[PDB]
Structure formats: structure tokens, C-alpha cells
Design a protein around this ligand. Structure first.
Ligand SMILES: [Zn+2]
Lengths: 293, 167, 119, 361
């Protein structure tokens, strides 16, 4: 704070996420609004669910090409309605993944009745609660360097292929969701995490559907054996109902490039084809459906 | 022509305008300005081995900018101007030399990008304290503000109860 | 050879003899009884009606432990016998319970309606 | 007929080319194979390479390497070929510590129940995800995955029945791929009329041939000799330009063709496809697309974090990666081939860019 302006300790900055209202799109794009410190505390009535007219906002873009808006000396705010007394149980829409390959006018968030094809990679960690670096069995490497005390927290990242009969997409699934992505009972997932705390880190990286483990990991450890066998078994590769975000914020600003060439090899015939870049989806929840196998 | 600290390349001379963070003596014939322009350095930024560690500036926050901070070494005639500058000043440099390391004193190969303003105003070398009226300074301050807000870095002040605002 | 497909027929279509005798079929109904001495049986079903029978052979393809009143799916052929009429020579016979039979009938309706809509 | 014939080389712009399309078995029997290149099939202009079918087993024959299941799905019946797999090199049981007991018993439990899911009997409800083959006028499915479907209530079968019409109407009965269809209409095909243009076309055909035949490295003569590439290098412009030495047309023209092939490979170098190791073979070239070792070592710069930063800077910058690679691999490593390798790995997803010229695994 106060890197150039002298207003040090002028209360903490505040960040609003808002759903735009317009008739120009069937789906309202979400947006971030930053209230930098000289305006604090904010106006009354800026609460979840409150419909608000924001006027004279400064539009701004990051170096990473993310659009976000910020208050200025002319920014003026006007609440139009109060929060509702009861939260609306809005279910997300259900669409086939082919709908997202159409580009614009496709929803930001959705559910899909897809089927897990294979698992690309899988990482488990235990990191220190006060500082984001690995902490095997609670042995913090940052101890004393800002880190006041040693205690550890688990973290997990997994990457999946999902396909629903119309299109195939790469799902990046993180933390508590993976326990459902693999389908373990909370007890068994807890036990697995508790064991892997001994080495503190487990990394796997697969050569593809049904293929062998890649040299980033080794056949020696029985841990890796158990995990690899599971991640290629019909116990994971199963039907689901996914709910996801399109990995890129809903906007027209995205860069673009032509469809790439890929050289398939099917039936001993070389196929050379133009092909789209794969969808990338961020998981929101995994659930079994109809207990299908 | 403007060029940013994220654009720099291994063996060059540049402007690289920035905001001054701190200062210190280095030698009877060299002096330190610690600076940033808000953009991410491509190589790990250079750090000056120095005669005393108590620099001028609000070091208790300057150290939190680490990856975006850069140490600038100015040699001869430029020093008596540098020694007078105030903390947090907006600053322009002329013909600042840029030099990539590839080795350390233990004969391990490691990469970091040095910055030098060698003696004499030859080849246009010098410095210029920027006034807040020019849109270049507005752009510098604006890039700093943007890099502060849409930062996405790990949060400092882990003892989150410390501030109490203007208590 | 592969057997010709056992397409779904409702008990009323065998009752009306709309499915030709000797053809492959699949059908449903609540196993009304279990004649083991002659390996003959009935699979009662009602659809806005009184229950109507469904004679089906059952000597080998499945010595099922399930009981009367349970619902069953049967697949195979049907052929005429003078006394017994048309009787189902089951190639598969299996039990089911809790099945939403009205929804199953609607599903058959949708399937055949789409087949119609398909050129 | 003009719309029923295979568009393009059935390029993968249509998303169902990468999907286990959920067709009716009878439609599998109605498919038309692609006459331009066999092995894939057509429905309503959609190219279909893989399918997902659900039905019941009504016929069985076991061979050495595979089971053959006759699967019925009301509309039709088809043979499914299922490769067998043994639980080879299974782990021994022992009275080990609680953690090892856990891992071993869990591995065996998973194995047991996977076999329980996989072993099949007559009358089973079955799902198969696979691809089509045709032989001796028979048509069959090769299974990539298959498993028994346990259903005491027939509800999933009913759901399948209800579902398929809707997805057909929404997708498969859509009679179009509707790409941009950027057809060049073979303009200037018979004659480039320009030496740089002909060189560019030669480079394009060269990369096509190279990745068609999975060429990892080649001496230039081994590519110059390709009869189709020669049938392109023999266009009139270069011949006429070479013909000035009327008494030595063969020599001048052969040298000019060698030169234009070297120029095409130079274009591919400047665009980052091929490179030369330090080997003394002045006209031997290696392709980035196939140097697995270079990929791996690059991957060890950011899968295994960059070693030089003292701060834990998540990933690494393009130039920092390039300097590290030049110091650890090859000082002459071109930025073009490194960019190509990074973009390739990102296509694989072995790497992901966080921002412009910054990457992390
Ligand atoms: Zn710690």
C-alpha cells in the first residue's frame, strides 16, 4: 500500500464482483470493481444481491489483458434495490460441450453430463500454513523467515479429460474437488493424505489413456503403484455430471490464432487435419449420476 | 523511446525510467539507487553488495517488492546528484547500461541482469528527477497502481491484525 | 450369425398379434406365476386395462430365484402352439423392481416416434 | 453428390471427431465409410471415429487375446471385440505396517472389484466405448473401455432411451459443420511463377511429408529424392530460370533444385521446425517435433522449478529459460525451436503459459 500516494494505512482496499445487466447478451458477464483507498468506507447498501448503478467508472486493463474497473473522483454509485430476504436457488444451465466450441454467446458457467476419459497429471502437497512452500511431516523450510511457527496444510491438483458424446475438454480440478473427481470416501482420502505426509509430496504424470507412467515418476514406490493403478481403472474413468467455469473470464478480449495441424494415425493410415484448441474448464463440482456403474 | 524493466535484454543500453525506492553509498566511486517501474523483471533482478546495509528509505516495505525491485549502480559524476534525492521520487535515467551475469564467485552458473551508469556523461549518461506534471510520470504511477491492485502475489503482513488504520 | 434384434413390444401388441409370430422381440411384465413342472409361466401386465397374460418358456436360460409379483424383462422370440397360443422362447429373462413402467412406456413411445420422424 | 461427399480430409473442426458419439447401434450399421481414406465413418456429414453404445450381451466367444460379445440394443445387434488384460506382476501380501497394509489391501480391493466390473456373463447389461471396423462385409466395434452395468431398476436404460433422441436432434441431425471453408480454389496451383513462392510451397509440402512419415532426421538428399516433392520442384519457373546453360541443362537444373530445397529447409529453420546438431553432416537436419530428449530437458526447467532464483518465483521467463537451456544444453539453441517446443508442450498441456513469455508446468 501507499507506493506513491502518501495515504498510508487508509483502511484496507475493497473488491466487488458484479454481474452486468444488459440486453446485449443472453448471459451476463461478470466483472471486478476495485475501490482504492481514498473513497473508503464505501457507500451504504453495497451488499451481495443489491442491484446497483455504477457510473463514471474508470475502465482499466492489466498487463495480462484482464479488464477491471476502479473508482475515481467522478465515480458515483446509486443503489436501485436491496438484497432479497431469501437467497434464490438458481440451478446452473445444462449444455452439451459442443455448445462452448461455438465461441461467443455461450455461457460462462454450466453443467454437463460428461464421462471421464483419462487422467493427465496429479500432484499432492503438504505446505506450511503461514508460507506457501512444502513442509514434509511439518518440517518447515521457511521457519523463522517470516514463518512464525510450523504447521502444515494439504493441497492437491489433478487434470482430467472429460467427454460427453459431442466434444472433449480438459478439466483442471483442484483441492477438495479432486476427492470427488477420484471418488474416494472422505475417510479414505484423509488416510491417503495422512500417509503421503511422510514424503510430503507425490507427483504422477501419465503418458495417456491406459498408458504407462512417465519418467517424471518412478515404478519403485508402492505409493505410486497404488495411485497409478487407480487413475487408469474403471473406478475413476466413469460417468459423471460435471459443473464448471470456462477457464477464461467471459469477455471478447481473448487473443486468437488459427486452428492447428495435428497428425493422427488411425487404422495405419496417416490423417493430417486442422483441429481446434482444446477446451479448458475449471471444475466447480463433481457428482455421480444414476449411480451409473 | 520508453522501454520497461520487463523488456530489457542481456547486453544493452536503455532509459528505464522508474520510481526511486531507496539509496546508499557503495564506494568512493559508486552509489546505489534502488528502484522499480512496476513491471516484472525477465531475469532475477540484480542486487548490489554494499558497504553498509542500512539503506535510506522505508525498507520495511521496500523488501516486500523484491522481485520487482532493481539495484542501479551509478559511478562517478552522477553520485553527488543521486545522494541528494528524496525517497519515493519519480526518476528517469539516460543510457543506463544493461549486463547479464552467467556465473557467481563459487564458479556456479547463475543468471541475473546488472544495471550500470558508468562515469562521465559520455553517450548521454545521466539522471533526471521527473515532475508530476508529465504524462510519463502519470503512466509510471498508473502502472505502479495497476501492478499493486491486479497483483496476484502472496500477501505480506501475515500478522493481519497489525494495522488498525490511522489509529 | 448374430440374432435379429429383440425390439421392444408392449404386451398389448402380442395380445393383438401385431408382432408377427416367430419374430424376435423384447417385452415386460410382472411374472404372474412359475410352472416348473412344464417350465411354462405368465407375465401379467395392465395398461389402463385388466391384466392380460404373457406366456414365456423358461427351461434353461435363467433359473431365477426371484418370485411372483416381481417385474421382469424378457427377450427372445415368440412362436405358436395350438393349445398355448404364441409363447415366448426367451433368450434372456431377468428380474427388475421399482421400475417406473409408465415412464418406460413413454420412453418406448419417444423411441418409436423418433424412428418415425427419422426418414 | 456434392454435400454427401467427404468435406476436406474430414478435418477435426467438427467437435464430434474427438467424441465417443452416442449413436444407435442400427445407425452404426447404416454408417457410410469415408472413401477418400478408409477407417472412419460418416453420419449426416459429421465425421465419426468413435462411439459409445449401451445394450445387453446375447452372444459370447472367447479367443486368446480378446472376447467377442454380441451386443443387442433393440434397434440392432453387433459384435464387440474386447481385449483381455491380466493382473500381471501383482504385489505380494505381507504382515507389514499399517500404512503398507493399507496400500496393499487397497490395491487388492481395487483389483478385485475391477475384475468384478470387467468379468461378463450372458444377459449382462453392457457399455462399450470404442471404434468401428469392417471386414468380410461384417461390421464390429473394437473396445477401448468396457464394463458391466449393474441396474436392478432399468432406470439407466430408460434414461438412455429418453436421452438419445434429444441429443440426436440437438447435434447429430444437424446437417452441417459450417466452418469458414477458406478454400483457395487451387489458385496458382500449376505454376507459382515465382521462385520465393515456389520455395514456400516446397517448404509447406516438405513439412507435410516430414510429419506424415514421422521423419525424425534426414539428410537433404533423402528428402529431395521424394517423387512428389520432386514433382513439385520441377515446376516450369525454376526449369526456365535454370535453362540459360542450354548445353548443361541437367547440371544447372539439378543444382538449382538442390538450392531451392536447401532454401525450403532454411525457411523451415527460420520458422523453427528443423535444426542441425554439431555433427559435421552439413546437410543433415533434425526436427524439433521428435527430439523427446530436448522436450524433457526443457520440461525439467519448470516442471522441476528453475534452480537459479533464490525466491520461489512460481515459473520461469522465456528468456531466462532460453539462457538456462543454452548454458545447460546447447549454446547455439535457437529461440525459434525453443518457442516451438514450448508451444508444442502447451498443446500437450505438459506446460501452461501464465502470461506473455512466462510458463509453468
Ligand atoms: Zn512455514
Amino acid at each position: 500500500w501507499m507506493k506513491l500516494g502518501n495515504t498510508g494505512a487508509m483502511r484496507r482496499c475493497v473488491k466487488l464482483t458484479v454481474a452486468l445487466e444488459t440486453a446485449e447478451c443472453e448471459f451476463p458477464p461478470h466483472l471486478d470493481v476495485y475501490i482504492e483507498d481514498p473513497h473508503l468506507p464505501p457507500s451504504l447498501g453495497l451488499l451481495p444481491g443489491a442491484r446497483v448503478h455504477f457510473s463514471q467508472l474508470e475502465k482499466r486493463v492489466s498487463r495480462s489483458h484482464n479488464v477491471y474497473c476502479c473508482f475515481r473522483s467522478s465515480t458515483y454509485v446509486q443503489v436501485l434495490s436491496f438484497p432479497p430476504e431469501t437467497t434464490i436457488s438458481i440451478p446452473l444451465p445444462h449444455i452439451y460441450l459442443a455448445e462452448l466450441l461455438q465461441g461467443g454467446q455461450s455461457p460462462f458457467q454450466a453443467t454437463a453430463s460428461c464421462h471421464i476419459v483419462s487422467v493427465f497429471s496429479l500432484q499432492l502437497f503438504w505446505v506450511c500454513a503461514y508460507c506457501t512452500s512444502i513442509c514434509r511431516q511439518g518440517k518447515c523450510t521457511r521457519l523463522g523467515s517470516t514463518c512464525p511457527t510450523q504447521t502444515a496444510i494439504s493441497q492437491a491438483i489433478i487434470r482430467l479429460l472429460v467427454e460427453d458424446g459431442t466434444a472433449e475438454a480438459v478439466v483442471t480440478c483442484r483441492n477438495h474437488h479432486v476427492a470427488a473427481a477420484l471418488g474416494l470416501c472422505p475417510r479414505e482420502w484423509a488416510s491417503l493424505l495422512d500417509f503421503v505426509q511422510v514424503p510430503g509430496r507425490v507427483v504422477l504424470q501419465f503418458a495417456g489413456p491406459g498408458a504407462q507412467l512417465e519418467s517424471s515418476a518412478r515404478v519403485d514406490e508402492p505409493m505410486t503403484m497404488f495411485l497409478w493403478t487407480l487413475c487408469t481403472s474403471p473406478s475413476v474413468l466413469r460417468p459423471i455430471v460435471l459443473s464448471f467455469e470456462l477457464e477464461r473470464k467471459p469477455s471478447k478480449i481473448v487473443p486468437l490464432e488459427p486452428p492447428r495441424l495435428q497428425r493422427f494415425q488411425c487404422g495405419e493410415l496417416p490423417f493430417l487435419t486442422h483441429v481446434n484448441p482444446r477446451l479448458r474448464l475449471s471444475c466447480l463440482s463433481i457428482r455421480e449420476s444414476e449411480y451409473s456403474s | 523511446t520508453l522501454l520497461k524493466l520487463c523488456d530489457v535484454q542481456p547486453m544493452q543500453y536503455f532509459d528505464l525510467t522508474c520510481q526511486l525506492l531507496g539509496k546508499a553509498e557503495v564506494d568512493g566511486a559508486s552509489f546505489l539507487l534502488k528502484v522499480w517501474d512496476g513491471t516484472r523483471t525477465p531475469f532475477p533482478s540484480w542486487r548490489v553488495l554494499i558497504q553498509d546495509l542500512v539503506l535510506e528509505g522505508d525498507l520495511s516495505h521496500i523488501h516486500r517488492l523484491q522481485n520487482l525491485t532493481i539495484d542501479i549502480l551509478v559511478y562517478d559524476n552522477h553520485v553527488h546528484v543521486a545522494r541528494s534525492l528524496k525517497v519515493g521520487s519519480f526518476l528517469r535515467i539516460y543510457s543506463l547500461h544493461t549486463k547479464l551475469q552467467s556465473m557467481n564467485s563459487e564458479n556456479q552458473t547463475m543468471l541475473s541482469l546488472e544495471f550500470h551508469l558508468h562515469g562521465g556523461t559520455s553517450y548521454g549518461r545521466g539522471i533526471r528527477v521527473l515532475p508530476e506534471s508529465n504524462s510519463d510520470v502519470d503512466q509510471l504511477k498508473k502502472d505502479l497502481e495497476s501492478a499493486n491492485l491486479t497483483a496476484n502475489q502472496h500477501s505480506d503482513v501475515i500478522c493481519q491484525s497489525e494495522p488498525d488504520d490511522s489509529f | 450369425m448374430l440374432p435379429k434384434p429383440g425390439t421392444y413390444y408392449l404386451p398389448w401388441e402380442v395380445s393383438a398379434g401385431q408382432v408377427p409370430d416367430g419374430s424376435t422381440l423384447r417385452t415386460f411384465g410382472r411374472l404372474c406365476l412359475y410352472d416348473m413342472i412344464q417350465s411354462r409361466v405368465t407375465l401379467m401386465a395392465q395398461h389402463g386395462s385388466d391384466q392380460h397374460q404373457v406366456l414365456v418358456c423358461t427351461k434353461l436360460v435363467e433359473p431365477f430365484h426371484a418370485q411372483v409379483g416381481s417385474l421382469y424383462i424378457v427377450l427372445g422370440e415368440l412362436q405358436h402352439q395350438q393349445d398355448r397360443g404364441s409363447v415366448v422362447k426367451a433368450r434372456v429373462l431377468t428380474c427388475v423392481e421399482g421400475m417406473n413402467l409408465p415412464l418406460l412406456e413413454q420412453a418406448i413411445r419417444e423411441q418409436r416416434l423418433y424412428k418415425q420422424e427419422r426418414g | 453428390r456434392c454435400e454427401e461427399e467427404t468435406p476436406s480430409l474430414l478435418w477435426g473442426l467438427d467437435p464430434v471427431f474427438l467424441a465417443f458419439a452416442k449413436l444407435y447401434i442400427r445407425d452404426i450399421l447404416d454408417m457410410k465409410e469415408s472413401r477418400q481414406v478408409p477407417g472412419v465413418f460418416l453420419y449426416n456429414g459429421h465425421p465419426i471415429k468413435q462411439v459409445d453404445v449401451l445394450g445387453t450381451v446375447i452372444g459370447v466367444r472367447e479367443r486368446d487375446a480378446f472376447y467377442s460379445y454380441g451386443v443387442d440394443d433393440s434397434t440392432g445387434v453387433i459384435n464387440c471385440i474386447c481385449w483381455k488384460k491380466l493382473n500381471t506382476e501383482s504385489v505380494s501380501a505381507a504382515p507389514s505396517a499399517a500404512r503398507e497394509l493399507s496400500l496393499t489391501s487397497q490395491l487388492k480391493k481395487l483389483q478385485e472389484t475391477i475384475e468384478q466390473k470387467t468379468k461378463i456373463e450372458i444377459g449382462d447389461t453392457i457399455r462399450v466405448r470404442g471404434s468401428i471396423r469392417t471386414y468380410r462385409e461384417e461390421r464390429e466395434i473394437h473396445a477401448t473401455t468396457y464394463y458391466k452395468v449393474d441396474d436392478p431398476v432399468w432406470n439407466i436404460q430408460i434414461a438412455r432411451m429418453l436421452e438419445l433422441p434429444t441429443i440426436y436432434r440437438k447435434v447429430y441431425d444437424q446437417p452441417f459443420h459450417s466452418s469458414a471453408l477458406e478454400k483457395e480454389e487451387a489458385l496458382s496451383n500449376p505454376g507459382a511463377l515465382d521462385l520465393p513462392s515456389l520455395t514456400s510451397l516446397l517448404s509447406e509440402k516438405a513439412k507435410e511429408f516430414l510429419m506424415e512419415n514421422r521423419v525424425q532426421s534426414f539428410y537433404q538428399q533423402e528428402l529431395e529424392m521424394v517423387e512428389s516433392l520432386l514433382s513439385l520442384a520441377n515446376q516450369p519457373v525454376i526449369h526456365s530460370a535454370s535453362s540459360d546453360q542450354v548445353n548443361f541443362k541437367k547440371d544447372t537444373t539439378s543444382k538449382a533444385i538442390h538450392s531451392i530445397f536447401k532454401n525450403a529447409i532454411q525457411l523451415l529453420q527460420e520458422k523453427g521446425l528443423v535444426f542441425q546438431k554439431d555433427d559435421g553432416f552439413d546437410n543433415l537436419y533434425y526436427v524439433t517435433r521428435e527430439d523427446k530428449d530436448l522436450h524433457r530437458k526443457i520440461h525439467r526447467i519448470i516442471q522441476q522449478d528453475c534452480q537459479k532464483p533464490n525466491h520461489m518465483e512460481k515459473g520461469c521467463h522465456f528468456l531466462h529459460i532460453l539462457a538456462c537451456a543454452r548454458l545447460s544444453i546447447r549454446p547455439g539453441l535457437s529461440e525459434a525451436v525453443l518457442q516451438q517446443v514450448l508451444e508444442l508442450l502447451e498443446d500437450q498441456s505438459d506446460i501452461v503459459s501464465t502470461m506473455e513469455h512466462y510458463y509453468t508446468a
